Design a protein around this ligand. Structure first.
Ligand SMILES: *[C@@H]1O[C@H](CO)[C@@H](O)[C@H](O)[C@H]1NC(C)=O
Ligand SMILES: *[C@@H]1O[C@H](CO)[C@@H](O)[C@H](O)[C@H]1NC(C)=O
Lengths: 73, 203
């Protein structure tokens, strides 16, 4: 699978590992949140990460499918 | 005198706009802390209080002068609030005294400055010795992406050298790491270095 990963500067596309089939999106909060909205971690995962109390977490199984709120897939 | 060097570099310059020749190239900055003292390891709130010196170095394309023809004066010290600064702050904060900068003939600026920081620490203990405490210190700009300002550590350790051996707390490591933070608001990532301090104690 090809996912966006945020480990990279600038943000770009990577082919996930073997077994890590899903692309995900994670968003929690800094308290820069007010000032610069929401911190985003994009990447790959084997199973969709269960996580946290406060999220805007999203899985997908398509190529392309976890972009930052940058633009559209 | 250097006051006619300082005549100045400052009618066609005020600290607002980044001193690059045109906007969408990048101004890098070298950053390193020199840990001086562990003021208090507040164990029961997990807050570390620390005294530090903060090295920041960068080029200002507008503050250049040819030395030979200003009677060869290499460089001047001038007010930090008077030159563009990467508004580089502490990201890791939980809860600082103005100084001056060594500007060079080639428009290179060297700003050391001292800080007090209350930053949060975390325990998970083994990596034994009996008690390690991790205290991260994360620095990055307050107003500029890595596409306006990229920020590099001077080396992959935080400078102990003039560290001042506290009696109950023992710096075992202070490695540095460089990351980007995405931030759903927008607009390129935000570069940040993390000095990571690991202590233990004699019983
Ligand atoms: C920023 O730093 C890199 C090396 O880290 C350097 O190659 C680059 O030229 C610097 N930026 C500019 C605009 O020169
Ligand atoms: C400290 O920072 C490093 C890298 O910046 C990271 O591996 C570690 O999880 C951080 N510790 C805490 C408590 O955030």
């Amino acid at each position: 699978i090809v996912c966006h990963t945020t480990a990279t500067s600038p943000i770009s596309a990577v082919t996930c590992p073997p077994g890590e089939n899903l692309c995900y999106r994670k968003m929690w909060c800094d308290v820069f949140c007010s000032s610069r909205g929401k911190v985003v971690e994009l990447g790959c995962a084997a199973t969709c990460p269960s996580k946290k109390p406060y999220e805007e977490v999203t899985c997908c199984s398509t190529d392309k499918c976890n972009p930052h709120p940058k633009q559209r897939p | 005198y250097a006051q006619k060097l300082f005549n100045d570099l400052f009618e066609d310059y005020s600290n607002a706009l980044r001193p690059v020749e045109d906007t969408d190239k990048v101004l890098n900055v070298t950053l390193q802390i020199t840990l001086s003292q562990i003021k208090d390891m507040d164990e029961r709130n997990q807050i570390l209080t620390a005294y530090l010196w903060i090295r920041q170095i960068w080029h200002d394309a507008y503050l250049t002068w040819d030395r030979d023809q200003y009677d060869g004066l290499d460089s001047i010290r001038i007010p930090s609030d008077l030159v563009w600064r990467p508004d580089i702050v502490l990201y890791n904060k939980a809860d600082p005294v103005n100084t001056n900068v060594v500007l060079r003939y080639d428009g290179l600026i060297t700003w050391d400055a001292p800080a007090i920081t209350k930053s949060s620490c975390v325990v998970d203990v083994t990596y034994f010795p009996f008690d390690n405490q991790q205290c991260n210190l994360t620095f990055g700009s307050w107003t500029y992406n890595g596409n306006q300002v990229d920020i590099f550590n001077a080396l992959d350790s935080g400078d102990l050298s003039d560290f001042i051996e506290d009696v109950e707390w023992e710096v075992h490591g202070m490695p540095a790491v460089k990351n980007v933070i995405s931030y759903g608001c927008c607009s390129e990532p935000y570069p940040d270095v993390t000095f990571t301090l690991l202590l233990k104690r004699r019983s």
